[PDB]
Every structure is written in C-alpha cells, then in structure tokens.
Design a protein around this nucleic acid. Structure first.
Ligand SMILES: [Mg+2]
Ligand SMILES: [Mg+2]
Ligand SMILES: [Mg+2]
Ligand SMILES: [Mg+2]
Ligand SMILES: [Mg+2]
Ligand SMILES: [Mg+2]
Ligand SMILES: [Mg+2]
Ligand SMILES: [Mg+2]
Ligand SMILES: [Mg+2]
Ligand SMILES: [Mg+2]
Ligand SMILES: [Mg+2]
Ligand SMILES: [Mg+2]
Ligand SMILES: [Mg+2]
Ligand SMILES: [Mg+2]
Ligand SMILES: [Mg+2]
Ligand SMILES: [Mg+2]
Ligand SMILES: [Mg+2]
Ligand SMILES: [Mg+2]
Ligand SMILES: [Mg+2]
Ligand SMILES: [Mg+2]
Ligand SMILES: [Mg+2]
Ligand SMILES: [Mg+2]
Ligand SMILES: [Mg+2]
Ligand SMILES: [Mg+2]
Ligand SMILES: [Mg+2]
Ligand SMILES: [Mg+2]
Ligand SMILES: [Mg+2]
Ligand SMILES: [Mg+2]
Ligand SMILES: [Mg+2]
Ligand SMILES: [Mg+2]
Ligand SMILES: [Mg+2]
Ligand SMILES: [Mg+2]
Ligand SMILES: [Mg+2]
Ligand SMILES: [Mg+2]
Ligand SMILES: [Mg+2]
Ligand SMILES: [Mg+2]
Ligand SMILES: [Mg+2]
Ligand SMILES: [Mg+2]
Ligand SMILES: [Mg+2]
Ligand SMILES: [Mg+2]
Ligand SMILES: [Mg+2]
Ligand SMILES: [Mg+2]
Ligand SMILES: [Mg+2]
Ligand SMILES: [Mg+2]
Ligand SMILES: [Mg+2]
Ligand SMILES: [Mg+2]
Ligand SMILES: [Mg+2]
Ligand SMILES: [Mg+2]
Ligand SMILES: [Mg+2]
Ligand SMILES: [Mg+2]
Ligand SMILES: [Mg+2]
Ligand SMILES: [Mg+2]
Ligand SMILES: [Mg+2]
Ligand SMILES: [Mg+2]
Ligand SMILES: [Mg+2]
Ligand SMILES: [Mg+2]
Lengths: 134, 122
RNA sequence: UAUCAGCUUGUUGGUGGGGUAGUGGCUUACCAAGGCUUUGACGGGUAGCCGGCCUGAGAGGGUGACCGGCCACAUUGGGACUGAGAUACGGCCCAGACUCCUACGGGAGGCAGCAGUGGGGAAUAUUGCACAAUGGGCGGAAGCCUGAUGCAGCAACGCCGCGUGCGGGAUGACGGCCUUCGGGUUGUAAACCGCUUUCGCCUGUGACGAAGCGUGAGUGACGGUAAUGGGUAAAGAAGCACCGGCUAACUACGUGCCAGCAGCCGCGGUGAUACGUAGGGUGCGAGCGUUGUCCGGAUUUAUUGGGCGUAAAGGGCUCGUAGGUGGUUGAUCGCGUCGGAAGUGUAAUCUUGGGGCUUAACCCUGAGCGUGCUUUCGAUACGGGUUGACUUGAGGAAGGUAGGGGAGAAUGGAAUUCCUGGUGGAGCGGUGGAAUGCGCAGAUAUCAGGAGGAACACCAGUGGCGAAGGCGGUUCUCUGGGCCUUUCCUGACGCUGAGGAGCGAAAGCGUGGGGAGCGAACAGGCUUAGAUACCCUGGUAGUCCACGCUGUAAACGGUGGGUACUAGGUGUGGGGUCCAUUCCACGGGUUCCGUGCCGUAGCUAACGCUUUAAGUACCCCGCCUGGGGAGUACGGCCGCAAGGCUAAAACUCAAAGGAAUUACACACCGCCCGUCAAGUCAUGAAAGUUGGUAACACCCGAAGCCGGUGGCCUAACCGUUGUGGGGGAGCCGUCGAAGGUGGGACUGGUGAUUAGGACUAAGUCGUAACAAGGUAGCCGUACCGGAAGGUGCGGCUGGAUCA
RNA sequence: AAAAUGUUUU
C-alpha cells in the first residue's frame, strides 16, 4: 500500500518530467500543496492548482503544470526524497544541506512551515529534510 | 538491505586471515634447525631450494627458506626466523635471517649486503 | 558467542527486629511466590575503562605506551584490627606454596617502590647525583625525611636541527667502464687556485633557573654545563636500498631451469636491462632496508556508500506472532524534531592567534573544539501520543459469474494382459543385424464369452484454475478461492512479517490391501578389446488404494510480497455496459480483471527486460561478500530408516565465474572425469589414554567478627570497705579459607586402526562431460556397479529434431 | 548402429 505520499509526488513529478508531459495530477494533501507552491516559487514548475473533486467526487486533486524551455529543455534536473518513512532525516540550523553546490534547493519542513534551505539558513531554523529538488 | 534489517542485524566484516601464525605476534623468532635439506620448486620453475625444518621457540615447527648463494647451517643450528613467503614452494612461509645467530652472511655479496648479512669489506 | 535456552529460593516483594556513617535481603524471623529472559537471561571467550593515539575526505576502523582521570591489585586464599580515612605495597592474624636461620625446641621473609640479578624473550637502560627547584610528611621554628621530583648515565628507539665544505677551474687529464675503436662516460668530478671555520678536537670566559631559602654567615645537584672569545686543519666526519612493469633509475661480464631472484605478474633452458659481479644511474641520507602489526587503497559489510534473471545472492509456497511501516483531515499534547539561555564537558592533547628557546622539534599563553548530557524558556511544519471526523485503501452485504481448485462416493467406454471356447497351422516375436524367448503339448493370428487392474483418445492449445507443489472420463454430494456491478454497509480495520506453524512433484519408509500395463534391482541374448551400458527377451520392489512418515527437486520466470507512476501496437480468457439492424445474435465500441507477443522512454557488462519491468519510487522480509575444502566435519534438533535442517576450521589456488566476439583457442592429435598405485601436507573417526578449567553436593574446619557462656583472673567504678559492678583469659555456637571424599559438566594433547580432502611422476584403468560428445545434459530420490558412471520415477531447458 | 586414446622439450 501507499507508504510515502511525498515520495509518490516526487516520483510522479520525475516520471512526468522525464516523459515530457505538460501536466501531472495526484491526490491532494496539505504538505503536497506546500511543496508544489515552493516549487513554483523557486521556478521548477510552471504552475500548480488544487481542484475540487468532480470525477471521483471524493477528494481534492493537486495538478502541477511543468515548464520546458526553448528546444524542449527540462526545467527540473532531478528530484530526490531524503526523509524516508523507513529512516527520517533532520538537519540543524548549522548543518543544513547544500544541493548541487547550492544551485539546487533542499526542501526542509521547519517549525515555521515549509522553507527552502536558503530561507531556513536565513531564519536559523532547522527541521526535517524532505527533498533535494534541483 | 532495509534500514530495519541493518538495525536488527548489522554488517560484519571479513575475517582478515593471518599469514604467519608461528611467529605469534613477533617480528622474528628464534629456533633450532631440526632438519636441513633441499626441496624441488613447484612447476613451472626447477631448482634445489634450500630449506630447513625449524623448531621455533613458540613451540611450533615450520619450514624456512635459506636465501643467498651459500649455506653453513646444519643440524641443531640456532637460527633467527622472520616472515616471508616463497611463492614457488608450497608450505614455506618463513625465511632465515642471514648474519644472525649461527647462520652467517653470504660469502661473496657486494650488492644488497644488508639483506644477506654481509659485513662491508674495505 | 545461540554449535550457550532456560536462570534464580535470600532468590523477588512485604512486615517486625538487628546492624551500619548511611539507604538496602545488608542481616534475621515470619508471610507471600515472585524476579530475569529470543529486544538474548544464564553460560563460554576475550578485556582494566577513559581523556587520548594511529589511520581516514569524512563516516568509520584499529588501539588504551609516555602524560592525565577513575578502578582493581601488592607471594596465593581468607580475615579483621587500629584509625577521620584501609585492596592497609615497604602493618597484623590464619592457611597454602616458596626462600632463609636454627643448638631441631623453634624462628624470619615477600622489588608489580628505585637501581640491580637470574630467567623467559626477536627485544627494552645505571646497583648514578642532589634535596638547589617544585610537591609531600612531622616541628612553634631553625630543621629533619622524601629512589616523589629535579637531574645525570645508557641505547639512532622516535621527532627536530646541523655538519661532512664554498667559489673558480677544459687541457674536458689519467684510471676504471663501455664502444660502432670514431669515441662516449664517470666529470668541474679530480688535479690545480683562492677562500670560510658551524660541529668535532685544543684553550679562555662563564650563566639563568633563587623576587627561593637562611636570624645571619651563607646557599645550584645539574656544572666549568649552556652560551661565548681564541686556535687547528678542507681537515676528524656517508652510508643504505634500488634500477623488467606497477616504480624514479641500464649496460657489460659470469652463469646456463644450474646457481639463484620474487610483493604480484613472473625471471633463469646460451645475446638474462629480473640471478652474481662491475661501471653508470635513481631514491633517500645518519640513516637505509627487511620482518611484524594496524589503518588506507577495499564502495572488498556499501549509514555516508553495494547488491541478488544468467556473475556469489529471492526462503519451495502460504498463513501468521513479536517487530518495522501507515490514506485525507479538525482539535490538542509538545515525547521525537527545531531554536535560545544557564550549567557541565579539568588539565594535557588537537585546531588556531600571539610569545619564548639562535631556527625547528619542543615549551608557554589566549581562543576554539570538547561533536554530548542535564536544567529551563520558546516554535508546532513533520513523526508519534490522545481524541473526532472522511471514504478513495481494505473488508462485508445484495445481485451477476468463469473454471482440469479440492475432498468423497458411485459409475462409463476403448485398449492391454490373463482365462474359457471356436477356427486354423508354422512360425511368432524382435533388431542396425541378430539371438535369448515363445510355438505342432497348436503359438502368432482370428471370433465369442468372462475376469481384473490401471490410465482417461477426441474435446485439449496459442487455453482455464490453484499460494506453491500441482489440477483433464461422466454423474451426484460436500467445500475453497477468484472476477464484475451501480447503488448499500463498516470507516484505515492496511502492508509486510524474524522465530513458529501448516501445505509441499517424484522417489523413499511403515502397516494392510491390490497388482493389468510399465519397470530400478536381477537373469539371459546381442554389441564390444571389455559392456557391471546403450539395444532385445524376461522380470521383483515400486507405480495403485487406505492410513501415517519423510519434507527434498533445474520446488525455475533461476526474477519475495504490497503500492504508485512512466509510449504504443496486437492476439486471447472472464464479468459488465452501449450502439445500429435485430427487438436474438452477427457486429462494432467502452469499462474492470487476467493472460501472451511486438515495442518507446528508461535500465543492463552484455544477453536482454520494458505497464505482467530486470524502468522511476516508498514500505517490510529472505539472502550474497573469491574459487575449492563444503552444505563436509564436530555439536544439536527432526526421522522407523534413508537422510533432512542448522553449520565451521585447518589447508590450498590466483584465479573461479557472467555475457558476448572471432567447457576447444597448444585450437578434436583439443579439452576433460573418477577409481587404483606412490609420495607429501593439513584434517575427521576411533578401544582408549593423558591433562586442564569452572563449579556443585557432603565431611572436617584455622584466623576472625558476631552471639553465648566464664566456677578462673581482675589497679580506676561503687561499697553494708566481708565486696559488688564492669572487664579479661578460657570455653561453646553460627558463619568461615584451605583440605578431604564423591559424582557430573566443559575442554587440550595423544591414540593402534580408519576416513575422506589438497598437492605432486611426464604411473595404471577406462572415456563420464564439452559437438546430437556419439544413449541430449542436469535436479531430487532410489537401487546397482573396479572407477568414471548405469538404470527407474518425477522435474528443468541452462537441449534439439521437425514446424 | 556401436567405433577408445594423444606424458616431461626449451
Ligand atoms: Mg526491614
Ligand atoms: Mg587481563
Ligand atoms: Mg576500546
Ligand atoms: Mg597512567
Ligand atoms: Mg575504627
Ligand atoms: Mg603500609
Ligand atoms: Mg599506597
Ligand atoms: Mg616491597
Ligand atoms: Mg625494579
Ligand atoms: Mg634470553
Ligand atoms: Mg619544601
Ligand atoms: Mg622553613
Ligand atoms: Mg632516609
Ligand atoms: Mg621507469
Ligand atoms: Mg650473459
Ligand atoms: Mg572500507
Ligand atoms: Mg590491506
Ligand atoms: Mg559488489
Ligand atoms: Mg528486489
Ligand atoms: Mg548464480
Ligand atoms: Mg520463488
Ligand atoms: Mg525450508
Ligand atoms: Mg502487527
Ligand atoms: Mg500519516
Ligand atoms: Mg494538525
Ligand atoms: Mg594549549
Ligand atoms: Mg620564535
Ligand atoms: Mg579540555
Ligand atoms: Mg497522531
Ligand atoms: Mg455471492
Ligand atoms: Mg481417497
Ligand atoms: Mg492431444
Ligand atoms: Mg502457453
Ligand atoms: Mg458513516
Ligand atoms: Mg518449517
Ligand atoms: Mg509417491
Ligand atoms: Mg508402500
Ligand atoms: Mg506391502
Ligand atoms: Mg530391459
Ligand atoms: Mg516445478
Ligand atoms: Mg534457489
Ligand atoms: Mg515473503
Ligand atoms: Mg516489487
Ligand atoms: Mg493486461
Ligand atoms: Mg538487474
Ligand atoms: Mg549434512
Ligand atoms: Mg579427534
Ligand atoms: Mg563447619
Ligand atoms: Mg566474644
Ligand atoms: Mg562479672
Ligand atoms: Mg570458634
Ligand atoms: Mg573450599
Ligand atoms: Mg592415528
Ligand atoms: Mg563419452
Ligand atoms: Mg552422452
Ligand atoms: Mg544396471
């Protein structure tokens, strides 16, 4: 059964980006919506939208529309899940990870909401290292 | 393996085989020559490699090679035995230190003298 | 460490007393029956722990020398005494083992303090000086004591620094070595010229450490030391390893698979850059090598940071316990998590900033580090706890529905064999060819009738079902699971699952039954050098049934389960639903679940996989760590047995292996298997034999503390001044080291004999495998055989013919 | 239709 819906989101995004799909969809959760929002604010996806259920009439659907540049070029070089259900990863304000030498962003869930490493370091707050999207 | 599998049963290293058990944690050991003889090398190769069955002071008896052209040690000759394998000789894992105790340096050495216990000549 | 699974009876708790500095089964009496343990108790092995040290990018790995902190111990075992304080090192008591003295009655002793001796060992120092400094003990103090300490001796043991010369010098001298006899090289090297004097040697000066100590006088062990002036002579001062590749550096001579070298690859068989020497060179240098050990390289135990289709690796399959893990969301807690504050993390080390030794090593000093922990105050995104919702995961209801799913019972037909009868007569049968065999005592053949056992042609595969193993005549009875559906219900109830349990082809085993055909073993015939085989004729277990046992397979998709996502194309099985003509169905769609083939992205060493993943991801389980030895030995468990399960080590090799290219590549005159014979090495079994360790149950029981008793002995106290109180010797009791006795547990050596393993003649016997290896190979099992192997039964393709 | 084998050079 489903164990890590965040990892499911990440793998859905990775597979869709690899297959050059314009949009991907998944069941909605608050943390998924937050990660999608910070992905959009960091420019890794074109946009995102939460849709009220009208096909299954059961639950909200989170849909990410991706962006490909000139000559069909990926805007996401990769995404990786860090804090797995089997083994969870927490980083302090001083030991915050760097992704792609600082080019990519680690997504960290801090006590002040979802914050990209750069943000956390500015606020000197750590938390659970969710992802390494770059 | 999963993280839970590693937690339940961790990694275990290899055994790290020992090479010279008879020395018993010593760089070299004293022994007495219980037998002095020659052995044919394994194939390929062919000679009359000079070896000795030695009763080392650890109580273990092993076969030691005698390096260098020249040889004086015989029955009940006290020798110093160091590590060192002779590849084309099955069962020989030790060598006899020339120039120490009864065994003496190779006579006509002029190069690599220290490895054969040959004093410098004026 | 599970090849140690049960441990404990003052043991766990309670109440009263006692005891102690103090809590306490610490002790005692009584009461209760607890306590610990597969998250590993108990037992075995090893070990002082740490600050640190080495290594490493880090994470880690190894380690516990000096120095510093804690602990333990002081000849072995036990005991108390004194004291503020005791494992009481240089105390006492008892016992044991030792050494010494003795007049034989009895006494004395403990270097793991410093130095030193013997011994063991590959290996580690002087029977030194001083209390001048710092620290300690006693004294009011002067002071005394201090093998702490400060120093010196010894050792290249480590680290650091310095020297053995510097400039000039072509005529590129001789001499070695090489040569193409031209020369090249050693080589600016030398000769020769001019310089400098660190260290060493000779000689002079000469400290700091002492702002100490002492009333003063006086007072430095180190010590004529460091430092420093003068003098001498370029002098007193360079070795070791290496030069085939990795790896910096090559030639000649000698040797001739010899002598020898080697870390691996390998070198040496007459042109050796690999042996030995020489010249030349290279790396280092008061060192240089070798050996040992550790880390690295090794991502070669992969948390960082690996894998399991074929390379080593998915459990035979499922159920399920602990455990791990968890769809959406409200509220709340603030355990994880995160952020401050305080405390702590001694010093030294370490990193770093300053400073001192002529520099450095080293030393001092400031800071950091001390990766944590405790306390406290905050944050609430996530994990978790508590609590409430939601239905999409999951399960259920109702309806629809496919099927060799299973078990039981009855029963159908063909065919084989046998029996009876009719007919008929010379062969039949069998093969590459034959023969054994059967048959005029009428076989084979042919017809009729009957008996019996086993398997179910066609349907039938490109298919269905089952968790797997597997499942096919028909009928009935009993029963399991799957699939679909719009409504319906419950509301995360899910997933996986160590250990455990069950199921588990065939062979095999036990009891009974049955026995047609088939058919291990067996007998005979053929083939053959032989034929314990292939082939032929016979033929017993078995194959079958009932009930058990065994529990293994190439139990394979060589691919664990669950989930989500990521082109298609095209067959086929099952359930719906839609459409037109019907008002069937043919047809098309569409949806859900199977089952194949092709194929994109992607992945893979390649082959190949590719929505039924071997792709992208998350959760849980099993498993791998070079090839042999070996899935073997020992032990234990299971079994009636066969055996299965768990599962090593010594030793040995430098490969073993995967896929592919053109099991062989020395290229089929290839490769390669196993007995037997010989030698060598390691190991197992074994009547036994020889030790060791850890305890147990009893008997006896020293010292000693405690508890009694004390008629004997008693200066302080009190006396009615005849004594009493209190104490002490002695004595008894509990505990108690050692010893004795006995029966077990564990374990080492050894063992006639015996077993297999590894390696070596270039030995003997066959040819089992690799090609269709000449009978396709292999897996499990069974029996047989000199040996490979042969055969039966079931299975696999890691075989193929023919499509 | 069965039809075996191929020491040690340097
Ligand atoms: Mg009490
Ligand atoms: Mg010890
Ligand atoms: Mg340690
Ligand atoms: Mg110490
Ligand atoms: Mg006292
Ligand atoms: Mg004392
Ligand atoms: Mg003391
Ligand atoms: Mg003493
Ligand atoms: Mg001493
Ligand atoms: Mg000695
Ligand atoms: Mg003093
Ligand atoms: Mg004084
Ligand atoms: Mg004294
Ligand atoms: Mg080179
Ligand atoms: Mg030569
Ligand atoms: Mg490593
Ligand atoms: Mg290594
Ligand atoms: Mg690997
Ligand atoms: Mg896997
Ligand atoms: Mg394999
Ligand atoms: Mg399987
Ligand atoms: Mg099993
Ligand atoms: Mg559970
Ligand atoms: Mg959750
Ligand atoms: Mg909430
Ligand atoms: Mg410091
Ligand atoms: Mg300085
Ligand atoms: Mg410190
Ligand atoms: Mg919760
Ligand atoms: Mg139904
Ligand atoms: Mg039955
Ligand atoms: Mg058929
Ligand atoms: Mg098929
Ligand atoms: Mg409801
Ligand atoms: Mg079982
Ligand atoms: Mg059977
Ligand atoms: Mg039977
Ligand atoms: Mg029977
Ligand atoms: Mg036969
Ligand atoms: Mg099968
Ligand atoms: Mg397997
Ligand atoms: Mg499983
Ligand atoms: Mg899977
Ligand atoms: Mg399909
Ligand atoms: Mg793979
Ligand atoms: Mg076995
Ligand atoms: Mg034995
Ligand atoms: Mg007693
Ligand atoms: Mg008493
Ligand atoms: Mg009295
Ligand atoms: Mg007594
Ligand atoms: Mg005793
Ligand atoms: Mg024997
Ligand atoms: Mg053959
Ligand atoms: Mg064959
Ligand atoms: Mg046979």
């Amino acid at each position: 059964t489903m164990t890590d819906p965040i990892a499911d989101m990440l793998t859905r995004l990775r597979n869709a980006n690899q297959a050059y799909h314009d949009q991907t969809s998944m069941p909605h959760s608050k943390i998924k919506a937050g990660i999608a929002g910070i992905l959009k604010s960091e420019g890794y996806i074109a946009d995102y939208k939460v849709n009220e259920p009208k096909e299954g009439e059961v639950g909200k659907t989170l849909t990410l529309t991706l962006k490909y540049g000139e000559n069909r070029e990926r805007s996401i070089a990769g995404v990786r899940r860090i804090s797995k259900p089997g083994l969870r990863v927490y980083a302090k304000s001083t030991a915050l990870p760097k992704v792609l030498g600082g080019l990519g962003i680690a997504i960290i869930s801090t006590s002040q909401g979802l914050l990209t490493d750069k943000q956390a370091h500015e606020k000197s707050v750590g938390g659970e290292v969710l992802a390494y999207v770059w | 393996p999963t993280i839970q599998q590693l937690v339940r049963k961790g990694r275990t290293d290899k055994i790290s085989k020992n090479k010279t058990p008879a020395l018993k944690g010593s760089p070299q050991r004293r022994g007495v020559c219980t037998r002095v003889y020659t052995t044919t090398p394994k194939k390929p190769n062919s000679a009359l490699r000079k070896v000795a069955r030695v009763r080392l002071s650890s109580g273990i008896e092993v076969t030691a090679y005698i390096p260098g052209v020249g040889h004086n040690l015989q029955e009940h000759s006290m020798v110093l035995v160091r590590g060192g394998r002779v590849k084309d000789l099955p069962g020989v894992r030790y060598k006899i230190v020339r120039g120490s105790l009864d065994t003496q340096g190779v006579k006509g050495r002029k190069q690599a003298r220290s490895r054969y216990g040959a004093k410098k000549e004026k």
